[PDB]
């Protein structure tokens, strides 16, 4: 499957609001330490005015905060989800399957990723490094993709439809019952990883 439409709409979703791409990688690296991240901490890391950080974050409507207004989730999160993203001894989480494949290159770490098949509840796991995936269990693991939508909550529009599956046939069965999803497509986790690599490549270009 040619994945250019997915890559294209994901980059567009990140390059839509100026600065977002430039705040993403530093914030992911900081969240990776496993503690909440203050806006003030972030502003210093980026060397931005606070108002610039705030404007970008306000545009990112799915961003997760704790009781202190600290950032605790943006793709990578401290708040439990179905996608477990373990770096070092530290259990973090991701908003969706494709997140888990993308972040390790962006944060320069190897993650032990685990979840369950969205069609059958079967456990799935794999090791994701900046350059490759290993220990893919089961070997035929698949991922669902949908097309990001322009004026749409990213987590509700994209992330919550982007799952792991035990296999491509299992995933395709599931897919046939959900054709109402825009640009719904099933790919192998290898193809999804490749998609993530093209996204990351392009992202690092658009940064300043």
PDB file of C-alpha atoms in Angstrom:
ATOM      1  CA  UNK A   1       0.000   0.000   0.000  1.00  0.00           C
ATOM      2  CA  UNK A   2       1.344   3.456  -0.896  1.00  0.00           C
ATOM      3  CA  UNK A   3       1.399   5.316   2.331  1.00  0.00           C
ATOM      4  CA  UNK A   4       2.091   8.858   0.991  1.00  0.00           C
ATOM      5  CA  UNK A   5      -1.408  10.135   1.864  1.00  0.00           C
ATOM      6  CA  UNK A   6      -0.939   9.180   5.523  1.00  0.00           C
ATOM      7  CA  UNK A   7       2.550  10.698   5.703  1.00  0.00           C
ATOM      8  CA  UNK A   8       1.282  13.789   3.968  1.00  0.00           C
ATOM      9  CA  UNK A   9      -1.711  14.428   6.235  1.00  0.00           C
ATOM     10  CA  UNK A  10       0.308  13.681   9.390  1.00  0.00           C
ATOM     11  CA  UNK A  11       3.021  16.192   8.418  1.00  0.00           C
ATOM     12  CA  UNK A  12       0.344  18.689   7.523  1.00  0.00           C
ATOM     13  CA  UNK A  13      -1.348  18.192  10.870  1.00  0.00           C
ATOM     14  CA  UNK A  14       1.951  18.968  12.606  1.00  0.00           C
ATOM     15  CA  UNK A  15       3.004  21.839  10.295  1.00  0.00           C
ATOM     16  CA  UNK A  16      -0.469  23.453  10.445  1.00  0.00           C
ATOM     17  CA  UNK A  17       0.173  25.500  13.597  1.00  0.00           C
ATOM     18  CA  UNK A  18       3.585  27.135  13.373  1.00  0.00           C
ATOM     19  CA  UNK A  19       6.012  25.870  16.028  1.00  0.00           C
ATOM     20  CA  UNK A  20       4.306  22.481  16.736  1.00  0.00           C
ATOM     21  CA  UNK A  21       6.946  20.457  14.917  1.00  0.00           C
ATOM     22  CA  UNK A  22       9.590  22.491  16.741  1.00  0.00           C
ATOM     23  CA  UNK A  23       8.078  21.884  20.157  1.00  0.00           C
ATOM     24  CA  UNK A  24       7.319  18.141  19.581  1.00  0.00           C
ATOM     25  CA  UNK A  25      10.719  16.486  19.782  1.00  0.00           C
ATOM     26  CA  UNK A  26      11.944  18.472  22.802  1.00  0.00           C
ATOM     27  CA  UNK A  27       8.692  17.817  24.660  1.00  0.00           C
ATOM     28  CA  UNK A  28       8.795  14.072  23.797  1.00  0.00           C
ATOM     29  CA  UNK A  29      12.362  13.875  25.109  1.00  0.00           C
ATOM     30  CA  UNK A  30      11.322  15.562  28.321  1.00  0.00           C
ATOM     31  CA  UNK A  31       8.172  13.469  28.868  1.00  0.00           C
ATOM     32  CA  UNK A  32      10.396  10.428  28.289  1.00  0.00           C
ATOM     33  CA  UNK A  33      12.047  11.076  31.691  1.00  0.00           C
ATOM     34  CA  UNK A  34       8.661  10.041  33.129  1.00  0.00           C
ATOM     35  CA  UNK A  35       7.748  13.203  35.052  1.00  0.00           C
ATOM     36  CA  UNK A  36       5.295  16.035  34.331  1.00  0.00           C
ATOM     37  CA  UNK A  37       6.727  18.905  32.246  1.00  0.00           C
ATOM     38  CA  UNK A  38       5.883  22.515  33.064  1.00  0.00           C
ATOM     39  CA  UNK A  39       5.226  25.111  30.380  1.00  0.00           C
ATOM     40  CA  UNK A  40       7.980  27.150  31.981  1.00  0.00           C
ATOM     41  CA  UNK A  41      10.427  24.247  31.725  1.00  0.00           C
ATOM     42  CA  UNK A  42       9.481  23.787  28.100  1.00  0.00           C
ATOM     43  CA  UNK A  43       9.843  27.473  27.246  1.00  0.00           C
ATOM     44  CA  UNK A  44      13.381  27.434  28.590  1.00  0.00           C
ATOM     45  CA  UNK A  45      14.260  24.274  26.679  1.00  0.00           C
ATOM     46  CA  UNK A  46      13.061  25.818  23.398  1.00  0.00           C
ATOM     47  CA  UNK A  47      14.286  29.304  24.229  1.00  0.00           C
ATOM     48  CA  UNK A  48      10.780  30.617  23.394  1.00  0.00           C
ATOM     49  CA  UNK A  49       8.621  33.304  24.998  1.00  0.00           C
ATOM     50  CA  UNK A  50       5.959  31.743  27.236  1.00  0.00           C
ATOM     51  CA  UNK A  51       3.228  33.152  25.002  1.00  0.00           C
ATOM     52  CA  UNK A  52       4.636  31.219  22.046  1.00  0.00           C
ATOM     53  CA  UNK A  53       4.623  27.921  23.944  1.00  0.00           C
ATOM     54  CA  UNK A  54       1.093  28.662  25.173  1.00  0.00           C
ATOM     55  CA  UNK A  55      -0.295  29.428  21.697  1.00  0.00           C
ATOM     56  CA  UNK A  56       1.080  26.189  20.253  1.00  0.00           C
ATOM     57  CA  UNK A  57      -0.217  24.164  23.200  1.00  0.00           C
ATOM     58  CA  UNK A  58      -3.645  25.813  22.989  1.00  0.00           C
ATOM     59  CA  UNK A  59      -3.805  24.686  19.337  1.00  0.00           C
ATOM     60  CA  UNK A  60      -2.952  21.151  20.448  1.00  0.00           C
ATOM     61  CA  UNK A  61      -6.312  20.454  21.972  1.00  0.00           C
ATOM     62  CA  UNK A  62      -5.699  16.799  22.984  1.00  0.00           C
ATOM     63  CA  UNK A  63      -2.705  17.712  25.217  1.00  0.00           C
ATOM     64  CA  UNK A  64      -2.978  16.168  28.697  1.00  0.00           C
ATOM     65  CA  UNK A  65      -2.415  18.039  31.959  1.00  0.00           C
ATOM     66  CA  UNK A  66      -2.112  17.117  35.617  1.00  0.00           C
ATOM     67  CA  UNK A  67      -3.571  18.738  38.717  1.00  0.00           C
ATOM     68  CA  UNK A  68      -0.852  21.448  38.495  1.00  0.00           C
ATOM     69  CA  UNK A  69      -1.360  22.271  34.828  1.00  0.00           C
ATOM     70  CA  UNK A  70       1.866  20.464  34.005  1.00  0.00           C
ATOM     71  CA  UNK A  71       1.983  18.664  30.668  1.00  0.00           C
ATOM     72  CA  UNK A  72       1.712  14.892  31.199  1.00  0.00           C
ATOM     73  CA  UNK A  73       0.757  13.727  27.695  1.00  0.00           C
ATOM     74  CA  UNK A  74       1.257  14.619  24.074  1.00  0.00           C
ATOM     75  CA  UNK A  75       1.356  11.419  22.046  1.00  0.00           C
ATOM     76  CA  UNK A  76       3.622  10.017  24.733  1.00  0.00           C
ATOM     77  CA  UNK A  77       1.865  10.166  28.112  1.00  0.00           C
ATOM     78  CA  UNK A  78       2.170   9.330  31.756  1.00  0.00           C
ATOM     79  CA  UNK A  79      -1.541   8.560  31.853  1.00  0.00           C
ATOM     80  CA  UNK A  80      -2.440   4.881  31.280  1.00  0.00           C
ATOM     81  CA  UNK A  81      -3.605   3.813  27.821  1.00  0.00           C
ATOM     82  CA  UNK A  82      -3.803   0.532  25.827  1.00  0.00           C
ATOM     83  CA  UNK A  83      -0.325   1.155  24.380  1.00  0.00           C
ATOM     84  CA  UNK A  84       2.453   0.463  26.832  1.00  0.00           C
ATOM     85  CA  UNK A  85       5.777   2.140  26.038  1.00  0.00           C
ATOM     86  CA  UNK A  86       8.501   0.972  28.403  1.00  0.00           C
ATOM     87  CA  UNK A  87      11.898   2.701  28.334  1.00  0.00           C
ATOM     88  CA  UNK A  88      14.538   1.636  30.862  1.00  0.00           C
ATOM     89  CA  UNK A  89      12.546   0.424  33.906  1.00  0.00           C
ATOM     90  CA  UNK A  90       9.929   3.118  33.310  1.00  0.00           C
ATOM     91  CA  UNK A  91       6.422   2.314  32.148  1.00  0.00           C
ATOM     92  CA  UNK A  92       5.042   5.095  29.912  1.00  0.00           C
ATOM     93  CA  UNK A  93       2.178   5.061  27.447  1.00  0.00           C
ATOM     94  CA  UNK A  94       1.277   6.194  23.939  1.00  0.00           C
ATOM     95  CA  UNK A  95      -1.959   7.418  22.382  1.00  0.00           C
ATOM     96  CA  UNK A  96      -1.882   4.893  19.507  1.00  0.00           C
ATOM     97  CA  UNK A  97       0.071   2.079  17.839  1.00  0.00           C
ATOM     98  CA  UNK A  98       1.837   4.286  15.320  1.00  0.00           C
ATOM     99  CA  UNK A  99       3.088   6.586  18.128  1.00  0.00           C
ATOM    100  CA  UNK A 100       4.966   3.672  19.629  1.00  0.00           C
ATOM    101  CA  UNK A 101       6.767   3.068  16.371  1.00  0.00           C
ATOM    102  CA  UNK A 102       7.663   6.753  15.843  1.00  0.00           C
ATOM    103  CA  UNK A 103       8.866   7.953  19.194  1.00  0.00           C
ATOM    104  CA  UNK A 104      11.966   5.804  19.753  1.00  0.00           C
ATOM    105  CA  UNK A 105      13.800   7.455  16.855  1.00  0.00           C
ATOM    106  CA  UNK A 106      12.741  10.875  18.100  1.00  0.00           C
ATOM    107  CA  UNK A 107      13.864  10.343  21.686  1.00  0.00           C
ATOM    108  CA  UNK A 108      16.933   8.266  20.875  1.00  0.00           C
ATOM    109  CA  UNK A 109      15.878   5.240  22.936  1.00  0.00           C
ATOM    110  CA  UNK A 110      14.687   1.672  22.583  1.00  0.00           C
ATOM    111  CA  UNK A 111      11.215   0.891  23.860  1.00  0.00           C
ATOM    112  CA  UNK A 112       9.540  -2.375  24.880  1.00  0.00           C
ATOM    113  CA  UNK A 113       6.091  -1.874  23.498  1.00  0.00           C
ATOM    114  CA  UNK A 114       3.028  -3.922  24.460  1.00  0.00           C
ATOM    115  CA  UNK A 115      -0.711  -3.787  23.819  1.00  0.00           C
ATOM    116  CA  UNK A 116      -3.635  -6.006  22.880  1.00  0.00           C
ATOM    117  CA  UNK A 117      -5.126  -6.854  19.536  1.00  0.00           C
ATOM    118  CA  UNK A 118      -8.127  -4.584  19.022  1.00  0.00           C
ATOM    119  CA  UNK A 119     -10.015  -7.400  17.246  1.00  0.00           C
ATOM    120  CA  UNK A 120      -9.321 -10.383  19.574  1.00  0.00           C
ATOM    121  CA  UNK A 121      -7.777  -9.112  22.811  1.00  0.00           C
ATOM    122  CA  UNK A 122      -4.672 -11.166  22.065  1.00  0.00           C
ATOM    123  CA  UNK A 123      -1.531  -9.819  23.661  1.00  0.00           C
ATOM    124  CA  UNK A 124       0.971  -8.208  21.287  1.00  0.00           C
ATOM    125  CA  UNK A 125       4.498  -6.925  21.975  1.00  0.00           C
ATOM    126  CA  UNK A 126       7.669  -5.815  20.208  1.00  0.00           C
ATOM    127  CA  UNK A 127      10.925  -3.971  20.746  1.00  0.00           C
ATOM    128  CA  UNK A 128      11.220  -0.690  18.877  1.00  0.00           C
ATOM    129  CA  UNK A 129      14.568   1.057  18.489  1.00  0.00           C
ATOM    130  CA  UNK A 130      15.445   4.171  16.486  1.00  0.00           C
ATOM    131  CA  UNK A 131      16.288   2.060  13.448  1.00  0.00           C
ATOM    132  CA  UNK A 132      14.404  -1.237  13.665  1.00  0.00           C
ATOM    133  CA  UNK A 133      11.872  -3.487  15.256  1.00  0.00           C
ATOM    134  CA  UNK A 134      12.647  -6.851  16.847  1.00  0.00           C
ATOM    135  CA  UNK A 135      10.947  -9.529  18.917  1.00  0.00           C
ATOM    136  CA  UNK A 136       7.750  -8.933  16.996  1.00  0.00           C
ATOM    137  CA  UNK A 137       5.138 -11.118  18.814  1.00  0.00           C
ATOM    138  CA  UNK A 138       3.192 -12.346  16.941  1.00  0.00           C
ATOM    139  CA  UNK A 139       5.341 -12.061  13.803  1.00  0.00           C
ATOM    140  CA  UNK A 140       2.359 -11.121  11.658  1.00  0.00           C
ATOM    141  CA  UNK A 141       1.294  -8.161  13.812  1.00  0.00           C
ATOM    142  CA  UNK A 142      -0.689  -5.529  11.923  1.00  0.00           C
ATOM    143  CA  UNK A 143      -1.683  -1.856  12.417  1.00  0.00           C
ATOM    144  CA  UNK A 144      -4.788   0.073  11.342  1.00  0.00           C
ATOM    145  CA  UNK A 145      -4.345   3.488   9.750  1.00  0.00           C
ATOM    146  CA  UNK A 146      -6.960   6.179   9.028  1.00  0.00           C
ATOM    147  CA  UNK A 147      -6.551   9.537   7.347  1.00  0.00           C
ATOM    148  CA  UNK A 148      -5.994  12.444   9.726  1.00  0.00           C
ATOM    149  CA  UNK A 149      -8.729  15.085   9.424  1.00  0.00           C
ATOM    150  CA  UNK A 150      -8.103  18.816   9.148  1.00  0.00           C
ATOM    151  CA  UNK A 151     -10.554  20.429  11.591  1.00  0.00           C
ATOM    152  CA  UNK A 152     -10.630  17.466  13.932  1.00  0.00           C
ATOM    153  CA  UNK A 153      -9.486  16.491  17.411  1.00  0.00           C
ATOM    154  CA  UNK A 154      -6.361  14.467  16.577  1.00  0.00           C
ATOM    155  CA  UNK A 155      -6.810  11.891  19.296  1.00  0.00           C
ATOM    156  CA  UNK A 156     -10.494  11.318  18.464  1.00  0.00           C
ATOM    157  CA  UNK A 157      -9.994  11.511  14.674  1.00  0.00           C
ATOM    158  CA  UNK A 158      -6.784   9.536  14.208  1.00  0.00           C
ATOM    159  CA  UNK A 159      -5.237   8.007  17.323  1.00  0.00           C
ATOM    160  CA  UNK A 160      -8.279   6.154  18.622  1.00  0.00           C
ATOM    161  CA  UNK A 161      -8.580   4.278  15.259  1.00  0.00           C
ATOM    162  CA  UNK A 162      -4.925   3.337  14.971  1.00  0.00           C
ATOM    163  CA  UNK A 163      -4.564  -0.033  16.738  1.00  0.00           C
ATOM    164  CA  UNK A 164      -2.360  -3.109  16.901  1.00  0.00           C
ATOM    165  CA  UNK A 165      -3.745  -6.441  15.639  1.00  0.00           C
ATOM    166  CA  UNK A 166      -2.550 -10.031  15.981  1.00  0.00           C
ATOM    167  CA  UNK A 167      -2.402 -10.432  12.166  1.00  0.00           C
ATOM    168  CA  UNK A 168      -3.261  -8.790   8.857  1.00  0.00           C
ATOM    169  CA  UNK A 169      -6.204 -11.213   8.166  1.00  0.00           C
ATOM    170  CA  UNK A 170      -7.595 -10.656  11.691  1.00  0.00           C
ATOM    171  CA  UNK A 171      -7.223  -6.916  11.156  1.00  0.00           C
ATOM    172  CA  UNK A 172      -8.835  -7.056   7.697  1.00  0.00           C
ATOM    173  CA  UNK A 173     -11.824  -8.940   9.132  1.00  0.00           C
ATOM    174  CA  UNK A 174     -12.174  -6.177  11.735  1.00  0.00           C
ATOM    175  CA  UNK A 175     -11.699  -3.501   9.072  1.00  0.00           C
ATOM    176  CA  UNK A 176     -14.600  -4.785   6.996  1.00  0.00           C
ATOM    177  CA  UNK A 177     -16.988  -3.983   9.864  1.00  0.00           C
ATOM    178  CA  UNK A 178     -15.617  -0.417  10.142  1.00  0.00           C
ATOM    179  CA  UNK A 179     -15.577   0.920   6.552  1.00  0.00           C
ATOM    180  CA  UNK A 180     -17.150   4.140   7.853  1.00  0.00           C
ATOM    181  CA  UNK A 181     -13.643   5.282   8.898  1.00  0.00           C
ATOM    182  CA  UNK A 182     -12.032   7.758   6.512  1.00  0.00           C
ATOM    183  CA  UNK A 183      -9.214   6.160   4.567  1.00  0.00           C
ATOM    184  CA  UNK A 184      -9.227   3.036   6.734  1.00  0.00           C
ATOM    185  CA  UNK A 185      -6.329   0.763   5.793  1.00  0.00           C
ATOM    186  CA  UNK A 186      -4.545  -2.272   7.294  1.00  0.00           C
ATOM    187  CA  UNK A 187      -0.779  -2.674   7.102  1.00  0.00           C
ATOM    188  CA  UNK A 188       1.846  -4.913   8.656  1.00  0.00           C
ATOM    189  CA  UNK A 189       3.666  -3.472  11.652  1.00  0.00           C
ATOM    190  CA  UNK A 190       6.769  -3.427   9.430  1.00  0.00           C
ATOM    191  CA  UNK A 191       4.976  -1.223   6.894  1.00  0.00           C
ATOM    192  CA  UNK A 192       3.737   0.981   9.787  1.00  0.00           C
ATOM    193  CA  UNK A 193       7.264   1.270  11.098  1.00  0.00           C
ATOM    194  CA  UNK A 194       8.416   2.333   7.652  1.00  0.00           C
ATOM    195  CA  UNK A 195       5.641   4.913   7.606  1.00  0.00           C
ATOM    196  CA  UNK A 196       6.899   6.223  10.905  1.00  0.00           C
ATOM    197  CA  UNK A 197      10.424   6.453   9.558  1.00  0.00           C
ATOM    198  CA  UNK A 198       9.298   8.587   6.579  1.00  0.00           C
ATOM    199  CA  UNK A 199       7.322  10.849   8.909  1.00  0.00           C
ATOM    200  CA  UNK A 200      10.325  11.269  11.190  1.00  0.00           C
ATOM    201  CA  UNK A 201      12.635  11.987   8.282  1.00  0.00           C
ATOM    202  CA  UNK A 202      10.364  14.721   6.990  1.00  0.00           C
ATOM    203  CA  UNK A 203       9.761  16.077  10.447  1.00  0.00           C
ATOM    204  CA  UNK A 204      13.466  16.522  11.149  1.00  0.00           C
ATOM    205  CA  UNK A 205      13.684  18.475   7.846  1.00  0.00           C
ATOM    206  CA  UNK A 206      10.870  20.913   8.714  1.00  0.00           C
ATOM    207  CA  UNK A 207      12.436  21.737  12.076  1.00  0.00           C
ATOM    208  CA  UNK A 208      14.329  25.011  12.527  1.00  0.00           C
TER     209      UNK A 208
END
